[PDB]
Structures are given as structure tokens and as C-alpha cells.
Symmetry: D3
């Protein structure tokens, strides 16, 4: 009771004996339950606010799975606390909204780089500092993905703090013209804070919004999106067990 407040990180609610060097983070608590379905020797470590923490084993390697909620600030709390617990490699398995015409639902966007349009990373360091993915992880992500059939795209994503501003339309058109693939709310924060803490980082994003329908298509779309999520998770697991 008391010794736990002493031993555990105050948000993710785990300690250095529990956290693997290899971590997958996602926004959605329920996705953690879906990811661990792919793993053996699964155990619940912690449940606190938006942070749901499990361990499991994938091809002989223990990997921690941690939800972080929506947005850079809640991501950053998890990154900092995971690092304190001995994390060394962290892969975001997340969602994005497409910023280009021909990216379909359930296709994958692999963020090589991210536009830092969120305030979280800016609290740490000048926006001029690059948010980019680790080569060692990109190498293994690319090697896995080229050997299967679902389309995927390597490039730049934009991370931001709101898609509900009145200038959303103008932002979308501007960033589409700059060649951005998709947008999320968390990737640039992981890349900036993660790298500053000496972490290897990457982000694999399931596309869940077309850049721009009946019940049937709706069901088809949901299945495509679940398939993309499963592919993203598997890619991250295959990558992390090879480190």
C-alpha cells in the first residue's frame, strides 16, 4: 500500500523490475488487451487512469505493452516513466488520419519524421530539433513490411494538439501540398522526448480516416481497420524481438 507509492512510477504504476527494455505504446487502453492476444505468458502489471500496462512474450522476448491516452502530454508522462523503469526501445502502434488521396483505411503509415505541431515536445526543446525515427527500428520495420501484401507508406506525419480548430480545412490543404502522409497527436512527442532520453523510437500508424456510405461498406471498413491494427502490432512485435 505505502511501499508501492514508494516503489512505483506515479502514473504508469510500475517499476524497473517489471518494465522490459522493449516497449510498445498505444493510445487506446483496450488495444493493449488486443495486442497481448498475440503474445504468450501475458500478465497485467497496472491499470491507472488511461495507462494500462501488460507484459507478454513474443518469440522468446519479453515486451511491455502500455496505453497512454490521447495527446502529447499523456504520451510524454508514459515515455518519461518508462525510461525511468529501464525502457531502451519504444514503438508507437497508433492511428492516423490520411493527408493524401490514395491512402486507404487500414493501410499503414510508418513515420520516418514528424512535424512538431504539438506543445509537449516544445516544453523540452526548441521546435528546430528534429523528430525522427531510429534507423535500427525502421530497418526491421521495412524488412518485415516489404515481405507482405498490405500497402504501407514511409514518410512524414504531422502531430498536433487539435483537429477541431476552425482552420482545420486550411491546415489539411497546406500539409497535403507539403507531402505529409497523415496526422496524429502523439508521434512527434515520442520522437523528440524519446530521443532526448536516449531511446530508440519508431511509430507505425493504422490509417483510420480517408483524406476524402452503407452499412456493408462500414463493416468492410471496420474490418480493414482491425486488420491494419493487427498488422501494425505484429510488425512492432517482430521488430522488438529481433533487437
Amino acid at each position: 500500500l505505502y511501499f508501492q507509492s514508494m516503489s512505483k512510477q506515479p502514473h504508469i504504476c510500475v517499476d524497473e523490475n517489471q518494465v522490459s527494455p522493449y516497449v510498445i505504446v498505444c493510445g487506446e487502453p483496450d488495444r493493449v488487451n488486443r495486442i497481448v492476444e498475440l503474445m504468450d505468458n501475458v500478465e497485467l502489471l497496472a491499470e491507472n487512469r488511461e495507462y494500462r500496462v501488460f507484459n507478454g512474450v513474443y518469440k522468446g522476448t519479453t515486451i511491455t505493452i502500455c496505453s497512454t491516452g490521447i495527446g502529447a502530454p499523456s504520451m510524454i508522462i508514459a515515455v518519461e516513466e518508462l525510461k525511468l523503469c529501464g525502457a531502451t526501445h519504444v514503438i508507437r502502434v497508433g492511428s492516423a488520419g490520411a493527408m493524401q488521396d490514395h491512402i486507404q483505411l487500414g493501410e499503414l503509415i510508418v513515420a520516418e519524421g514528424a512535424v512538431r505541431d504539438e506543445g509537449g515536445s516544445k516544453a523540452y526543446i526548441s521546435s528546430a530539433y528534429p523528430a525522427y525515427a531510429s534507423f535500427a527500428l525502421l530497418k526491421e520495420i521495412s524488412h518485415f513490411l516489404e515481405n507482405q501484401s498490405v500497402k504501407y507508406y514511409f514518410g512524414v506525419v504531422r502531430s498536433h494538439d487539435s483537429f477541431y480548430t476552425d482552420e482545420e480545412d486550411q491546415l489539411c490543404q497546406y500539409w497535403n501540398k507539403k507531402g505529409i502522409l497523415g496526422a496524429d497527436m502523439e508521434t512527434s512527442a515520442l520522437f523528440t522526448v524519446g530521443r532526448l532520453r536516449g531511446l530508440q523510437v519508431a511509430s507505425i500508424l493504422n490509417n483510420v480516416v480517408l483524406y476524402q456510405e452503407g452499412v456493408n461498406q462500414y463493416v468492410n471498413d471496420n474490418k480493414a481497420m482491425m486488420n491494419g491494427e493487427r498488422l501494425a502490432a505484429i510488425t512492432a512485435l517482430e521488430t522488438l524481438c529481433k533487437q
Copy 2:
């Protein structure tokens, strides 16, 4: 199944038939369950990611209680979607870390104004725009609080995107000297986006960190903090039922 995706807001997962004009938001999903204990005719509306949504009745008035997770971006999603569902008055019942010496655990900070050191509100509008609380709500909050015994403080809070930066110490000292009462991660975003959407807004914050111990004191502190949380919730309910 399909008609719900059509009818419901995509994150808070409720609609205009469900949401009251009077809303309490908090960060912690489990706090929603604790708040509804104070109300009659309670019903669960939605559970999705960090968003836990309930209705209840307090002295004859239906009030919606909604969790929003940690951070401006997840707060802003809830504010926008609640507004779309017909919200008119929104009170944050939250936590803060004290920025002055003599504010004890479980004492209350009522944010009249907030420093916009989070990126969420800045996506909407120049930082020069003021984040401040509505007079009509402050009037009722003050009237309720002056008539009881737990100490409380009206003034400025700072809202930010991370307390884990290496400059945290320097920030704390600078803001203490400027007379800031406490810090959270959400208040300025509610005040800025809320006001721009025509909402009446206020924020009542339980102090959960001293500016600067045995098992006994630890238990005493936890009880003080639970008491503050209950006081903050009651103050918000008493305020909203009087509108």
C-alpha cells in the same frame, strides 16, 4: 451499431439527447464514479478510451459528468464534443500541484485565470487571448465556499504540457515569484476553447502536491485529498444546480 456512429460524437460517444447543458469534467475516469455517488437517478451513458460519461440529478437538476484524461488535447476533444451536444456551462473538477508554500494537501484552488503554457489553446488562438473563469460561476463557487471550513484560494494557475522537463525547478521558482497558486495541465485549455465556443467555464482544483514521511501521515494525506475532491465536486454540483 451503424446508426450510433452516425448519431454519437466520435470520442465521448454521446449525443444531444443525452448531454445536459450543465457539465462537470474531470481527468480521472474513476472520479466520475465517485462524483455520481453524490447524485440521484444515475446512469452510465458511454465508456470510450479515457472518456467515461454519466448523467445524474442533484437537487432537481440533471448534470452530465465526463472524464477527459490527462492533458489539453484530450480535454479539448471533450469540450468540443460536449458543446456540439448542447453543453452551456462546464466546470472542471480537477487536481493541481501547489506553487506556493502554505497551500496544504486537500485545500482548494479556484482558478480565476490561467497561464496558457499548453499548446492546445494556442492551436485555436494567439496566446494573448485571456484564459479566465466565468463571473456567474465564480460568484456561486465563492458563495458556497465562504460558508464552510476547508481553506481555499482564488487566483492564477499555470497549465502546461509537462512537469518532467529538465527546467522544471527553474519554472517552479519563476512562477512562485509571479504569485501563481498551483499548476495543472488542462484548465487554460478549457477556459480558452470553452469561452470561444460561448461556454460558461470554471475550474476547482484539489491540491495534491505540496510546493515543498511515515505511513500514518501518508494515510492522513490521502484522506485530506479525498476530502478536498469531495468538496470540489459538491461545490460544482451546488453551483450548477443553481443556474
Copy 3:
């Protein structure tokens, strides 16, 4: 002669024996003469540059009236020097240009908050810090105003350093859409610097420009505006004598 330069503040030209804790500031030197007409036991304290300083008594309470000229920088000099002389409560009685269609000439705008689009306050502190009015003063201003007939509006004003830029039209339309009530040049500076110096602050503004005529209407308009000015002054006096 010499001992005065020693004793008196270098711009407002008064000292701590002369200044009341309760102060009204306005831009126009001649308005000070008009305000003191409402008071008993009136005396001229100082006249220097744009700073005209008088004391008077209103319902038993000594109140200092001080002109400050146009603009944040000259306002800030007065605020700093008044504070040095023992001011604790300061109310701006000023003019504004309406930023919404149905605010008439001589109607009042009570600034709850102000957009800090002037450089004066920015010399002191990040623009993220809120410029807002003190609750204790707003309470008394509201109580007085609701009990009379001239229309008045509580909300946000914009304070700026020039209405003569070539982008004035675009500014007006943008700020009208954001719901700003009116604009002046001084309010945000009083609220920011004032609050940082521990002052209670508020601002009551006579509307002197329509958002958008014969000699008769011109005379009618001037009388409406003089009436608004008298109402603003009386509201400030009634508020300050009740502290």
C-alpha cells in the same frame, strides 16, 4: 523644490501620504475634473505631463483620481507609481470602440478579460499570462449596474497599440468573429501589470465608436457618450467606497 524630487514619484508627482488605496485611472486629463464633480472635499495633488492627480471623497471614502494619457506605456508608469504610493484597488474608467453590431454609443463594456495585443504587458511577462478583472470588483460593478437602465456588457476587450495600421479592417472582422466586445489601448496593461503588483483591478469602458449623420444626431450622440462616462465613473466610485 529639491525635497519634492526626493519625496514624489517622478511622473505622477505624488507620494504615499497623498495616494489613497482606492484609485480611479482614466486616459483623459479633463475627465479627472469631470469625475471630481461627483465628489466632496476635492483637492488637486499634481499636474505633470499627461498625469493629472486629484483626491476626493465619495460616501465617506477617500479616492484618488489620476489621468494616464493614451496607451499602455503611459498607463504602466501610473500603475507602477501608484502602487509605490500604496494603491491596492485600481479601476480604469475609459473609452472603447465597439467590436459588435448592437452596442450603442454611451453603453458600457465591463472588461472581464483582455486580449494582450499591446507591447507594454509583454515587457513584464509572457503573453500567455491572463489579463483579467478582479472578482471582488466585478461583483460590486455587476450589483450596481443590474439595478439601473443603461445597457452594459460583460466580456472580452482587445487592447492594442494602434488602430491606424493598414490591417485594421482585417483585425476588426477577425476579432468580431471571436466575440470580442470592444477595443481600447490600456486595459490589458492595467490587468497584467496591476495583478503582478498585487492590485485589485477592473475596467469600465464607455462606448464611443459604433462597430458600424446630421447635427442633431451628433448632439444626441455626444450626450449619450457623456451620460455613459458619468455612469462609468459613478459605478467605479460606488464600487470603491464599498471596499
Copy 4:
């Protein structure tokens, strides 16, 4: 009465039939009375708020003298309105505080350039735009000054919106190290807005603060300062009558 509001600029309260192409502006209304003592055929044109407006003749040339109060915003109003009335050449005759050790009271600083640390000019244009004095006026100012005995300095001044911030000491040391001669509140605004309106501009500043005493020295200092003011005025008059 009515036709005047129609004909006159709304602050300086004069029109194009009254204003000379050649204008001296100063901050202090009473200095206008002191300047016109040096001129023939003197007439009062207008008195409104901090704006005191006179015409006079110096060696055959009509020159308008206009006070503007303290600060960029009130300066800018005067500059804009004077321009509307047909001003083409404008010289500030003002005061400064020395930013270097060996500049004495009543010695002159001629601003070739100004640091734009005031918000007024920034409302018009990016701070990157240069605030500098017109060569044609500097030529005549230099020619006059080299032929007399009071020391004077050509260089950079800093214009700002407050000397009362808590960082004043640090600003002073930083700007002294950069070689700035003195500081005022108005010069950069005149140079920026003036030049953008196609005006020839210059600024001659009497030093009234040492960078860093008995009644006798105090009297001596006041006389030195009055002498500097008279020299600055004469230099501006001699310059303007030669255009």
C-alpha cells in the same frame, strides 16, 4: 462645432490647412510652449488630451510643434494624423536615459538607428524592418552640431514600453555591452511608422539620466538639462528651415 469634427483630425485636432510640411514632435506638452519662445508669428492651433499644437516661424519657414505624450502608441497617433495633414519632415525633440558611462546630463544623443523594443511599430510591420534616421536630416543636424561646444553622440538608441520591469537592470547591462547610447520610449516608432508613411524622420534627444547629491548639483543638473533641451530644439529648427 459639428463641422470641426468633420474637418479636424480626431486627436491632434488640426487639419491640412494648419499643419506645415515641417514638424517638431516632443513628449511633453509644456515643452511646446518653451520651443515656440524661439520662434516668431506663434499661434496656438489645438489642445486636446496630451496633444498641444502650435505653429511658428523660424528664419522665414513655418514649422508646426506638436506634443505627443509618453510612449509609442500616443506618438503613432500623432505621426499618422500629421501625415494626413501634409507633414513631410518630422523631427523628435525628446529625452533619453544614457546607456553609457560618460554621457553627461544635458548632452545630446542623435539617434541614427533605434532598437524596436516597443510594440507600436510591431503592429505595422515585422521587427526585422529597420528603424533609422533620414540622411538629409542627419546631414544638417551634424553640420549644425559640429559647429558648437556641447558634446553630442551619434548612434543607436533603444525604444521600449517600460523601464519599470524587474529585469530592467539586466536589460541595461546587456544593452550597454551592445554599445547602445541611450533609451527612450518613442524614437523607433517614429522611425518605423514615419518611414512607412514616406516621411523624413530624425530624433534628437536630451540626456536626462546618467547611466550611473546636494541641492547645488541638483540646480546645476537642471540647468544643464534645460540647456540641452534648448540646444536640441534649436538644432531641429535650424535643420527644418533649411529644407
Copy 5:
């Protein structure tokens, strides 16, 4: 004579018939002559200002070598004009100053990412946009380098516009603590403008300054540095001929 001004890019002075899709850029004109020593079928294309342009063949592949002078602005001219001439892959072979203790002279820094502390890239796009190297090129650079003996480092470099500011020491210490490997003046500009133009980009930098000596050591150091330069060039040639 005339038809050339018509056909050739105005600075690099070549056209689309001359430029290969595969390009090496360096700052120093004389380094181009040193690089082509490693190639067959060498020809001078153009010499204009700091731009020295040659073609050559390396293992069957035509590669253009182009000098760009010092600094982002001259780099950007070359990048834009090369792109206009059909460039698709561009590798900087350059120099850097080490920002960490144990990087020796003539060891290599491979920039995965760059801090955009130069104004050139900022003319194009918000500093939040990432400057990072292309995965396809990093893969081949890494594969080549791991198979030889000279030490090399993958990571972040800082690109800036001056190492002669008075704050240079403070910059060095700050950026060393953030884990930056070295600094140059050009890399972030190539990565930002290059990527926005759809180019594959990378940067291989010879270390020519220790973070912190006799004639003998001086000679040894020069030879180490020439060796590093040759290694960087060969790595770029080996990478480009494999595309």
C-alpha cells in the same frame, strides 16, 4: 552565349541534359577536384562563383559533383537548381565540428537528423518540420561503413548560421548536453528543402574540429582529416551507384 543564359540554371550554370539523378554536393570547390580523382570519364561542366560542377562515372553510374560554398543560402540555391535539372538523390559530403568529447579528427558523423538553427530552411517552412536523412541512403551508408575500420557515428547534428557569436560557448555546452554529435552550416537546409522537393537526401561529415600541439601532430591531424574526407566521398559514391 545568349542561348546559354536561356538554357542553363543561373548559378550552377548547367542544364537537365548534364545533371545526373545522383548528386554529391560539398562546400569546398577544390574538394570537387579531389572527389573526381576517384571516378572515371570525368568532365568539367561549369565553374561559376562558388559552384564548381563536374560529372564522372563510378562503377558504371554517372554522378554529378557540385560545390556549394559555405552556408544554407548558397546550399539552397544549388539544391533548387539541381532539382530543376533532374536530381533525385543528393548526398552532402562535408565537414563538421565535433560536439562530443571522444570524436576524433577524420572520424565520420552521419547525420540522421539535423537541428534547424539556420534561417534558410525557415524561409520555406515552419521550424517544426523535421530535417532528417532518407532511410534508403542511410541503409547503404551504414552497410558500407560497418564493413571498414574508421570510427563513425550516426545521430543528430546542429546546422547554424554563425560560430562566431559571443554566445558560442554557451551554445556548445547546451548542445553537447542534448547529445548532438557535431555542427555544420548546411545539413538541415539540404534535408528540409531537399525533402520538400521530393529528393532523397543524406549527409556524411568529416570531423575537422575537436570538441576540446607540435608540427608533427599537425601533419598527422591533416592526414587523418584527408583520410576522413576520402572515406566520406567513397561512401557517397558507393551508396549512389547502388540506387
Copy 6:
């Protein structure tokens, strides 16, 4: 060999025994050869990268001529190193693109002031600091130019880091409306860094682009431009020998 690295500045490759107090800088190395044609007792001092350094004598005065390449960063290196070698007066003889309709090719623009839209000067000091030309040099430039026939214009130039951005058209129209005469890439950097180092500075620019043709006109235009360049050089030489 070794003692030179010890004695010489590391880029311009000369020392304090070689550099005159009076310096002309230009961007183009080959222009240095063209300038020295106008001088007696000419000697090559150094050739390194874009820096070509010569001395010569003009009417009895030794003057150093130094090329600096394109862009603020390479200019700034030269300015810093020249200053270290005892430079006191520096005149840029350069090229500009006209920003107004009736400035012809080979006519001269004399920069009184410069817009600091380049990052080099911003590394040293806030953009608010003015970039302007020295009066003593402008006086002599004006005196020389008024006594000949080629048209010339005194005013503001804009210095920037790229004319190849997609917003170039919008920049041109905006700056034309603000009254800017022409644009280059170097002038504001010389004026800012130069003045901060205590240098007298000026910039004389040959117009080489119309704001907005046969072989004949092309030849005529080239000759006009060569004539302007010769006039600019002569004006700088005549100015410097008179110091």
C-alpha cells in the same frame, strides 16, 4: 606551412599585417579581379574557398578587396575575420534585384537600411536591432554620386536567405508595397554584425534584375550591368580613400 595556420585567419587566410582598415567586400570572387583593375600596387593575399583577397592602392590609400560568396553566413565569417585583422571601414559592393518598377539594370541602390530577413544577423541579436548604414560613408557616397549621371536610389533593401520559396511572388508584392528598393542576401548581415563589432559599414548595389528579349537587348543589358558594377566600385574606392 604550420606557422601560417597559427598566424592567418582560418577562412580569409590573411593576418593583421595584411589587412587595411579600409575594406571592400563583394560576393563574386571574379569581381575582385575586376575591382583591382582600378587600383595600383595590386597584390594577391589569399585564395581560399569563396574568399579571394587582394590589396591595392587608390589615390594613395591602401584598400583590401575581399570576396565572400553568396549569403549571410559566408559574409559574416569574412566580416568577423576582417575585424580581427584590423578592419574599421567596410563597404559592400554587390548586386540586388529591384523591388520597384522604374529601377533599370545597372542603376545603383544605396542601402540606408536593410530588412533583416536572413538568419545570420539573428544569431547575434534580436531582429529589433536596426541594420543601417554609417552616416560618414553615406555622406561621401552621396557627394560622389550626385556629381555624375547614372541614376541611383537611397533607401531600404531587404536581405533574405532564399528567392526560391513558393511564396516568393507574395513576398515581392508585399515588400514592393512597403517601398523597399531592392533585395539581396548579405547587406543586413554586414550592417548588423559590422556595427556590433564597431565597424563603419555601407552597401552599394548594382541592379541586376528588373522588378518586371533579343540578343541585342541582352548585350545592351550586360553592358549596362558591367557599367553599374564599375560605378559601384569606383564610388566605394573614392569614399574609402577620403577617410
